[PDB]
Amino acid sequence: DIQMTQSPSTLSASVGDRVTITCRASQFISRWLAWYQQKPGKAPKLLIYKASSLESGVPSRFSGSGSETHFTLTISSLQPDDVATYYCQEYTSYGRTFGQGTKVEIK
Amino acid sequence: DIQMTQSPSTLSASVGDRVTITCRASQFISRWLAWYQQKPGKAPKLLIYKASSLESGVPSRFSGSGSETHFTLTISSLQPDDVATYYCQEYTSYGRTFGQGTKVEIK
Amino acid sequence: DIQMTQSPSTLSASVGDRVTITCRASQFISRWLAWYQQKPGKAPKLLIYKASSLESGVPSRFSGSGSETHFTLTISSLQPDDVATYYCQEYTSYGRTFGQGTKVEIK
Amino acid sequence: NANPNVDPNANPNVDPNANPNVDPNA
Amino acid sequence: QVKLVESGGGVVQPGRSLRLSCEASGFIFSTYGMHWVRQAPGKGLEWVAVIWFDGSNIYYADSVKGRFTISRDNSKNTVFMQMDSLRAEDTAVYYCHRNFYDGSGPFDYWGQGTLVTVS
Amino acid sequence: QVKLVESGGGVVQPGRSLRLSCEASGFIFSTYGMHWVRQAPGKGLEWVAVIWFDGSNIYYADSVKGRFTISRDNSKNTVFMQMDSLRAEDTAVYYCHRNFYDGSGPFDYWGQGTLVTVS
Amino acid sequence: QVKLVESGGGVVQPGRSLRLSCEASGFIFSTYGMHWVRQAPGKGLEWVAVIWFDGSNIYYADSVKGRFTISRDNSKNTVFMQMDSLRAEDTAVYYCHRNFYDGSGPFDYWGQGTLVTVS
Numbered sequence: 257d258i259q260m261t262q263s264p265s266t267l268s269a270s271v272g273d274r275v276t277i278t279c280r281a282s283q284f285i286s287r288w289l290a291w292y293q294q295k296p297g298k299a300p301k302l303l304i305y306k307a308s309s310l311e312s313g314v315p316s317r318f319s320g321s322g323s324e325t326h327f328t329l330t331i332s333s334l335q336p337d338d339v340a341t342y343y344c345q346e347y348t349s350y351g352r353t354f355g356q357g358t359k360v361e362i363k
Numbered sequence: 364d365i366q367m368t369q370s371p372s373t374l375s376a377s378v379g380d381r382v383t384i385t386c387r388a389s390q391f392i393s394r395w396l397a398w399y400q401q402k403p404g405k406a407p408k409l410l411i412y413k414a415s416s417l418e419s420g421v422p423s424r425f426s427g428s429g430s431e432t433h434f435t436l437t438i439s440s441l442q443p444d445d446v447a448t449y450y451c452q453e454y455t456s457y458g459r460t461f462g463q464g465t466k467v468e469i470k
Numbered sequence: 471d472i473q474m475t476q477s478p479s480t481l482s483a484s485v486g487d488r489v490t491i492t493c494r495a496s497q498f499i500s501r502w503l504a505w506y507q508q509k510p511g512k513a514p515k516l517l518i519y520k521a522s523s524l525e526s527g528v529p530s531r532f533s534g535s536g537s538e539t540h541f542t543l544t545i546s547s548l549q550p551d552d553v554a555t556y557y558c559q560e561y562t563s564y565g566r567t568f569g570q571g572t573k574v575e576i577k
Numbered sequence: 578n579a580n581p582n583v584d585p586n587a588n589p590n591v592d593p594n595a596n597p598n599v600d601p602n603a
Numbered sequence: 604q605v606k607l608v609e610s611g612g613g614v615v616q617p618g619r620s621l622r623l624s625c626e627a628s629g630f631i632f633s634t635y636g637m638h639w640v641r642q643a644p645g646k647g648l649e650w651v652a653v654i655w656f657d658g659s660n661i662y663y664a665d666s667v668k669g670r671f672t673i674s675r676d677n678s679k680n681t682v683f684m685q686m687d688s689l690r691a692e693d694t695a696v697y698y699c700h701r702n703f704y705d706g707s708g709p710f711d712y713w714g715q716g717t718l719v720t721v722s
Numbered sequence: 723q724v725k726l727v728e729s730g731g732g733v734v735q736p737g738r739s740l741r742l743s744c745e746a747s748g749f750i751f752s753t754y755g756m757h758w759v760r761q762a763p764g765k766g767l768e769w770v771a772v773i774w775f776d777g778s779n780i781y782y783a784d785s786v787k788g789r790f791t792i793s794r795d796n797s798k799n800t801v802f803m804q805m806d807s808l809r810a811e812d813t814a815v816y817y818c819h820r821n822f823y824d825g826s827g828p829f830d831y832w833g834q835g836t837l838v839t840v841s
Numbered sequence: 842q843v844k845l846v847e848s849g850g851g852v853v854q855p856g857r858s859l860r861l862s863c864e865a866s867g868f869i870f871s872t873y874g875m876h877w878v879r880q881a882p883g884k885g886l887e888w889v890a891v892i893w894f895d896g897s898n899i900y901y902a903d904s905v906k907g908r909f910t911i912s913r914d915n916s917k918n919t920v921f922m923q924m925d926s927l928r929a930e931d932t933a934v935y936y937c938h939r940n941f942y943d944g945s946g947p948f949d950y951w952g953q954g955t956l957v958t959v960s
Contacts, residue, residue: 565771
């Protein structure tokens with residue numbers, strides 16, 4: 257029973273801005289936090305392998321950090337192509353736990 | 364014992380055409396597949412570092428992709444300078460496994 | 471203790487001539503070698519940052535290449551404006567190691 | 578350190594490290 | 604080429620069972636494990652269950668315990684999900700996911716999902 | 723307009739200390755690390771010390787280690803280097819250097835240097 | 842600036858042996874191992890053998906097992922391969938190659954190749 261929480265449930269910024277998405281856990285993730293991007297209607301794609309490790313093929317504009325129970329996803333130079341719901345995934349055992357999802361829109 | 368196979372043993376296309384070479388592993392090799400270009404009489408040139416990652420100095424025409432067991436080398440806008448025998452190479456352990464090789468010809 | 475040695479510590483050539491400086495590491499450094507140009511009275515200027523990858527603004531005269539332990543800085547079409555002491559720098563870890571410094575003069 | 582979703586076996590041909598002066602993600 | 608292909612959805616009246624499946628293709632499921640991820644329309648993702656290869660590790664989300672069972676057809680390289688006594692709250696798209704990390708990089712593999720309606 | 727500006731130099735009697743500092747301007751020391759580079763007049767460059775962001779990964783050259791202490795002032799965005807028991811071999815210009823590589827390019831960032839003379 | 846140079850090829854009567862060597866230059870064979878790659882005329886590449894630094898992780902292709910021995914001269918920075926009981930099917934160009942990846946990119950290092958004729 258580990259709760260995952262994304263406090264900024266909705267964010268919006270203009271094109272070219274910086275979006276900060278925080279993520280917390282009731283128990284330690286210890287950097288095993290994957291970040292996923294879900295475009296509605298499609299299965300989610302993995303963006304961030306683990307805390308501060310970007311997956312190849314994912315734009316360099318994505319970055320992040322964290323450890324223990326506190327993590328952040330940063331989206332630099334926000335594009336219309338980034339409107340997705342972003343999710344936190346804990347993968348510390350045999351199964352995954354997901355966050356609520358944060359919707360990032362364009363101003 | 365890994366048996367790497369390159370399917371299109373002979374390719375032929377006009378200049379500017381797009382050709383692909385596929386390579387299939389008999390075992391999971393986790394993206395650890397390199398691609399080489401061997402012109403007649405010369406030692407082979409490394410083109411693709413790891414599946415999906417191009418070696419510095421190699422023209423952008425060459426693009427690798429694929430994972431686990433099924434890999435591809437794509438040559439966009441094929442040039443006369445690309446006539447070579449291309450080989451896929453497994454590198455998951457000590458030693459290397461080379462595929463049969465495919466020859467790319469120009470129409 | 472990665473000792474860095476620049477063998478040709480004193481060079482001299484006429485303007486337009488080609489000269490080279492050879493830097494030999496006592497240890498493997500995997501191309502993490504930078505070269506600097508120090509003009510009298512000034513802090514060192516970076517010219518090459520990664521075994522031939524150049525610093526923006528660097529004249530086409532400067533180049534270099536190398537690997538593992540043996541690296542070279544080359545200056546094509548040497549100008550009076552290049553009379554500087556050149557240094558090679560190992561940057562594989564925390565802290566940096568500089569070579570002795572090689573001075574290039576004009577004939 | 579242990580994680581069932583991760584295979585802890587380095588490829589002998591690749592150095593499993595990074596240069597601290599360089600951002601690992603290019 | 605690795606793909607996960609879901610099938611077996613439809614409309615299940617309340618209290619009825621459903622049997623979903625995910626056909627493996629491009630790989631042999633002989634390594635890590637397979638996950639079912641559920642998403643009710645308008646809601647976020649919920650992990651539902653995992654069947655680790657050879658069944659040594661079976662885990663479920665609290666929300667489905669005692670109602671869902673998972674298993675594998677070891678001849679057809681296909682993962683099955685037995686959903687008994689379904690309730691309205693179980694309406695969702697059920698996705699087949701096969702995530703692992705192994706030296707060279709991450710692997711995820713998501714299918715398209717099977718829509719299960721329970722009204 | 724990103725600068726490193728050194729200070730705290732001067733002439734010191736052998737056996738006495740100086741406390742050097744380098745102000746960060748145009749950037750925040752929030753990421754990689756900071757170095758001091760020494761150059762005795764007429765000699766080449768010598769690396770002296772590195773401090774890594776958050777005050778860790780502290781390393782010194784053998785020629786200075788135990789005499790030099792490097793620390794970070796987290797409120798003033800300034801790096802300090804305490805130089806104790808100075809000797810004639812420590813006469814040099816001490817340069818502040820912030821070097822890292824990423825993304826679009828190299829970052830070298832050199833200051834002008836503060837002169838330390840032991841007399 | 843890195844060279845691997847093969848020598849010791851030539852024409853050898855079937856049933857006899859050759860001792861090939863690869864001189865390393867431009868790099869101490871400090872860490873990653875060295876491979877012999879064979880190319881029969883008209884055919885693709887075949888890996889034959891690897892010697893690892895310090896002579897530990899030594900492997901051969903099945904096609905040469907029991908016939909080839911690989912070893913390093915640890916004073917001259919060179920690798921030798923003793924090929925005993927040579928047969929007509931072993932005619933090939935034998936290339937020296939060292940492959941290791943590390944951060945900054947790949948290091949392929951291929952030599953020129955020495956031809957071994959076994960007719």
